[PDB]
Design a protein around this motif. Structure first.
Motif, PDB file in Angstrom:
ATOM      1  N   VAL A 136       0.790  -1.232   0.000  1.00  0.00           N
ATOM      2  CA  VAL A 136       0.000   0.000   0.000  1.00  0.00           C
ATOM      3  C   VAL A 136       0.830   1.293   0.000  1.00  0.00           C
ATOM      4  N   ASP A 137       2.060   1.255   0.484  1.00  0.00           N
ATOM      5  CA  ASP A 137       2.797   2.475   0.776  1.00  0.00           C
ATOM      6  C   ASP A 137       4.260   2.256   0.520  1.00  0.00           C
ATOM      7  N   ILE A 138       4.882   3.192  -0.188  1.00  0.00           N
ATOM      8  CA  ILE A 138       6.314   3.219  -0.339  1.00  0.00           C
ATOM      9  C   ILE A 138       6.892   4.199   0.665  1.00  0.00           C
ATOM     10  N   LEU A 139       7.803   3.667   1.466  1.00  0.00           N
ATOM     11  CA  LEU A 139       8.280   4.329   2.651  1.00  0.00           C
ATOM     12  C   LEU A 139       9.548   5.064   2.326  1.00  0.00           C
ATOM     13  N   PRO A 140       9.871   6.081   3.140  1.00  0.00           N
ATOM     14  CA  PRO A 140      11.024   6.875   2.825  1.00  0.00           C
ATOM     15  C   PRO A 140      12.291   6.055   2.926  1.00  0.00           C
ATOM     16  N   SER A 141      13.285   6.403   2.135  1.00  0.00           N
ATOM     17  CA  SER A 141      14.530   5.687   2.139  1.00  0.00           C
ATOM     18  C   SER A 141      15.764   6.595   2.267  1.00  0.00           C
ATOM     19  N   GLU A 142      16.747   6.148   3.033  1.00  0.00           N
ATOM     20  CA  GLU A 142      18.010   6.860   3.099  1.00  0.00           C
ATOM     21  C   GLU A 142      18.993   6.015   2.326  1.00  0.00           C
ATOM     22  N   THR A 143      19.304   6.414   1.103  1.00  0.00           N
ATOM     23  CA  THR A 143      20.237   5.644   0.324  1.00  0.00           C
ATOM     24  C   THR A 143      21.643   6.106   0.648  1.00  0.00           C
ATOM     25  N   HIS A 144      22.588   5.208   0.456  1.00  0.00           N
ATOM     26  CA  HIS A 144      23.986   5.462   0.687  1.00  0.00           C
ATOM     27  C   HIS A 144      24.758   5.303  -0.636  1.00  0.00           C
ATOM     28  N   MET A 145      25.445   6.362  -1.074  1.00  0.00           N
ATOM     29  CA  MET A 145      26.273   6.374  -2.264  1.00  0.00           C
ATOM     30  C   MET A 145      27.759   6.420  -1.945  1.00  0.00           C
ATOM     31  N   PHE A 146      28.532   5.540  -2.581  1.00  0.00           N
ATOM     32  CA  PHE A 146      30.000   5.431  -2.400  1.00  0.00           C
ATOM     33  C   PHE A 146      30.726   5.520  -3.732  1.00  0.00           C
ATOM     34  N   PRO A 147      31.997   5.992  -3.734  1.00  0.00           N
ATOM     35  CA  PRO A 147      32.855   5.946  -4.929  1.00  0.00           C
ATOM     36  C   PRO A 147      33.098   4.510  -5.345  1.00  0.00           C
ATOM     37  N   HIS A 148      33.280   4.262  -6.626  1.00  0.00           N
ATOM     38  CA  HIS A 148      33.505   2.887  -7.091  1.00  0.00           C
ATOM     39  C   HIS A 148      34.347   3.008  -8.320  1.00  0.00           C
ATOM     40  N   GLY A 149      35.628   3.257  -8.084  1.00  0.00           N
ATOM     41  CA  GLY A 149      36.599   3.347  -9.150  1.00  0.00           C
ATOM     42  C   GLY A 149      36.495   4.742  -9.672  1.00  0.00           C
ATOM     43  N   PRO A 150      37.321   5.062 -10.682  1.00  0.00           N
ATOM     44  CA  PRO A 150      37.443   6.404 -11.260  1.00  0.00           C
ATOM     45  C   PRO A 150      36.268   6.815 -12.144  1.00  0.00           C
ATOM     46  N   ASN A 151      35.406   5.887 -12.571  1.00  0.00           N
ATOM     47  CA  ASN A 151      34.257   6.337 -13.373  1.00  0.00           C
ATOM     48  C   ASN A 151      32.874   5.726 -13.043  1.00  0.00           C
TER      49      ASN A 151
END
Length: 217
Positions: A136-151
Motif C-alpha cells: 500500500v505504501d512506499i516508505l522513505p529511504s536513506e540511500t547510501h552512495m560510495f565511490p567505485h573506481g574512477p568512473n
C-alpha cells in the motif's frame, strides 16, 4: 557545456521499460518533467496491458538520479555524466520474494533525458504481496552512495513497502552507476540521498530526493 550546466533549466524525461515478471512480459512507458531547481518531481507511467501483472510499487525506482537536489559541497555524479550519458546495473532483492534486476541507459536529447531499461523480475511468489497487489505504501529511504573506481558510483539502500494487512516487505537495493564517456569526472565522496516517494494499468508518482552528509568523528 557539460555536467550540471546542462541541468540549470527546466527539463523533461522519457522512460521505456522492457520487462518480465516470472516470464510474463510487460512494457511501460512513462514521462515527466523536473523544474529547476531539481528535487521534487513527478512521473506518469502506463503499461501496455490492462493490469500490470505485478504490483506497481516495486516499479517505483525504475521510473532519475540526475534530478535529485545536491548541495554545492557534494558532487552530483549523475549530472556530471552528461552529455555522454550513463548506465545503471541494479538489483533489488525482496526478502522472502523475488529479485528484480535491471540494466538502464540514459541519454540527453536537448532538455529531455531519455532512459531505456530492461528488467527481469524473477522468483516472485504468486501467493505473496507483490504478485497479489497488496503493497500500500512506499516508505522513505536513506540511500547510501560510495565511490567505485574512477568512473562509477555504487548506491545501496533498503526500500520498505507496507502491506495490506499491516506488515512490511523490504527490498535490498544495490545499484551501480557508470559514466559512458572517457573524460575525467569528479567522483563524489561517500554520502546519502534521501528519497521520499508517493505513488497513485497506470500511475502517477511523486519523488522528493536530496543529498546530505552526516558528521564524521
Amino acid at each position: 557545456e557539460v555536467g550540471p550546466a546542462l541541468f540549470q533549466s527546466d527539463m523533461t524525461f522519457k522512460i521505456f521499460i522492457d520487462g518480465e515478471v516470472n516470464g510474463q512480459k510487460f512494457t511501460i512507458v512513462a514521462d515527466g518533467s523536473s523544474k529547476f531547481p531539481h528535487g521534487d518531481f513527478n512521473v506518469h507511467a502506463v503499461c501496455e496491458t490492462g493490469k500490470l501483472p505485478m504490483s506497481w510499487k516495486p516499479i517505483c525506482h525504475l521510473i532519475e538520479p540526475f534530478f535529485a537536489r545536491y548541495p554545492d559541497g557534494i558532487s552530483h555524479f549523475a549530472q556530471e555524466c552528461f552529455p555522454e550519458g550513463l548506465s545503471i546495473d541494479r538489483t533489488v532483492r525482496f526478502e522472502n520474494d523475488g529479485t528484480m534486476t535491471s540494466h538502464h541507459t540514459y541519454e540527453l536529447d536537448d532538455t529531455c533525458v531519455v532512459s531505456r531499461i530492461t528488467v527481469n523480475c524473477d522468483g516472485f511468489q504468486p501467493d505473496g504481496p507483490i504478485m497479489r497487489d497488496q503493497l500500500v505504501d512506499i516508505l522513505p529511504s536513506e540511500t547510501h552512495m560510495f565511490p567505485h573506481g574512477p568512473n562509477a558510483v555504487r548506491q545501496t539502500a533498503t526500500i520498505g513497502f507496507t502491506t495490506a494487512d499491516g506488515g512490511k516487505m523490504m527490498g535490498h537495493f544495490d545499484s551501480k552507476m557508470t559514466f559512458n564517456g572517457s573524460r575525467a569526472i569528479e567522483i563524489p565522496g561517500p554520502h546519502f540521498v534521501t528519497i521520499i516517494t508517493k505513488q497513485t494499468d497506470h500511475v502517477c508518482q511523486r519523488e522528493v530526493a536530496y543529498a546530505h552528509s552526516v558528521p564524521r568523528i
